């Protein structure tokens, strides 16, 4: 019955709003156009005055604030996961495993909400760091964000809104094919109901967008690739910057 899927869609949207303070709707109002105009960081001076207005090497300090924001995002995604019906009733090891692998695919999904072709909102939308300034950071740091922009440009052309994303990131978390899952079947039963929900949601919300559901699920492939590329550059950093510390919560996601 569609009524039950609409109720699930509504539940997850409500929890998403509660768990993610910077939504895509807010990010697009900030990026498009008086009380919400962000300060723009495009070089080192705008950076140093940006810290003054908004709020070690330049690249490492940017990398470490990015680290802190990721930890914060992990916390938010975790809070959202527990609202997905059935999630907290799963085996606790499977909960950990589903978060461990799901968290980065969700981070880059939602970070797309904060991006356009030219840069990324930061500091809850108070700031905007341009793509070019990031790419000009010294190796290996200038190559961190470029694949994320490349994904976001394609992903953002689907024109999903927050109510679509709430279901989609739930579908991501409840992925039966994560390595080491002790009991795959109850996870998959939840995901099918979420997939049903996502499907009805995309049909109702984007009636003229043919096979959006299929196109969205195929994006769940560019995501895995970005994760793989990402952990590769972190390992470069561990050996390059033996003075630089990774946050422990992020340490455990990457083991
Ligand atoms: C300034 C951190 C404030 C943390 C609370 C909320 C933050 C909103 C989201 C991100 C804020 C960015 C923090 C540090 C990142 C700077 C740019 C790194 C590249 C990127 O990340 O694309
Ligand atoms: C950038 C550099 C490093 C990490 N990491 O240490 O995992 C993460 C990121 C990143 O993509 N952070 C982030 C998360 C959410 C919003 C903006 C930036």
Distance separating alpha carbons of residues 183 and 89, to the nearest angstrom? 12
Order of strands across the sheet that contains 127-130: 39-41, 127-130, 119-122, 115-116
Closest ligand 2 atom, CA of 120? 17
Give me 65's structure tokens.
């604030």
Of 120, 145, 135, the C-alpha closest to 30 is 120
- Say yes or no: CB of residue 152 within 6 Å of ligand 2: no
Whether the bond between 140 and the residue before it is cis, its omega within 30 degrees of 0, is yes
3 state DSSP class of 116: strand
Distance separating alpha carbons of residues 2 and 24, to the nearest angstrom? 26
3 state DSSP class of 79: helix
Closest ligand 2 atom, CA of 73? 15
Q: Is 196 exposed, middle or buried (0-12, 13-18, 19+ CB in 10 A)?
A: middle
The DSSP call for residue 138 is P
- Structure determined via: X-ray
The ligand minimizing its distance to the Cα of 27 is: 1
- The separation between CA 86 and the C-alpha centre of its own chain, rounded to angstroms, equals 22
R_g over Cα of the chain: 19
CA of 187 to the centre of ligand 1 (A): 32
- Say yes or no: CB of residue 23 within 6 Å of ligand 2: no
Residue 231's domain comprises 1-255
Q: Please name the helix (run of DSSP H) or strand (run of DSSP E) that holds residue 130, with its range, or none.
A: strand 127-130
Of 149, 142, 137, 162, the C-alpha closest to 222 is 149
CA of 57 to the centre of ligand 1 (A): 17
Task: Please report, for the domain that includes residue 168, its CATH number.
Answer: 1.10.565.10
SS (H, E, C) 185-250: HHHHHHHHHHHHHHHHHHHHHCCCCCCHHHHHHHHHHHHHHHHHHHHHHHHHHHHHCCCCCCCHHH
Residue 123 marked in a binding site: no
Of 46, 38, 237, 29, the C-alpha closest to 143 is 237
Distance separating alpha carbons of residues 195 and 247, to the nearest angstrom? 34
Number of domains in the chain: 1
Cβ pair 115, 152 in contact under 8 A: yes
- Say yes or no: CB of residue 227 within 6 Å of ligand 2: no
Long-range contacts formed by 176-180: CB under 8 A, 24+ apart: 178/97, 178/98, 178/100, 178/101, 178/102, 179/97, 179/101, 180/93, 180/97
Task: Give the sign of the dihedral formed by CA 170, CA 201, CA 203, CA 151.
Answer: negative
- Say yes or no: CB of residue 155 within 6 Å of ligand 2: no
Q: Which residue has the tokens 């968290």?
A: 103
Q: Breaks in the chain at C–N > 2.5 Å: after which residues?
A: 33, 55
Distances in Å between the alpha carbon of 222 and those of 165, 225, 228? 16, 5, 10
């Amino acid at each position: 019955e569609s009524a039950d899927l609409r109720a699930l869609a509504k539940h997850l949207y409500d929890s998403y709003i509660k768990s993610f303070p910077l939504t895509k709707a807010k990010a697009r109002a900030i990026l498009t156009g008086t009380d919400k105009s962000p300060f723009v960081i495009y070089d080192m001076n705008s950076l140093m005055m940006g810290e003054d207005k908004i709020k070690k090497e330049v690249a490492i300090r940017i990398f470490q604030g990015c680290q802190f924001r990721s930890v914060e995002a992990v916390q938010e995604i975790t809070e959202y996961a527990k609202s997905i019906p059935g999630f907290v009733n799963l085996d606790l090891n499977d909960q950990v495993t589903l978060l461990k692998y799901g968290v980065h695919e969700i981070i880059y999904t939602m970070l797309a909400s904060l991006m356009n072709k030219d840069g990324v909102l930061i500091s809850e939308g108070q700031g905007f760091m341009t793509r070019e300034f990031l790419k000009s950071l010294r190796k290996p740091f200038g190559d961190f964000m470029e694949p994320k922009f490349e994904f976001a440009v394609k992903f953002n052309a689907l024109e999903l809104d927050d109510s679509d994303l709430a279901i989609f990131i739930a579908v991501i978390i409840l992925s039966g094919d994560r390595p080491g899952l002790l009991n795959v079947k109850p996870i998959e039963d939840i995901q099918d109901n979420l997939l049903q929900a996502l499907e009805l949601q995309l049909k109702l919300n984007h009636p003229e967008s043919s096979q959006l559901f299929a196109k969205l699920l195929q994006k769940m492939t560019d995501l895995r690739q970005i994760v793989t590329e990402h952990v590769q550059l972190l390992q470069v950093i561990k050996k390059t910057e033996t003075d630089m510390s990774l946050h422990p919560l992020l340490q455990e996601i990457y083991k």
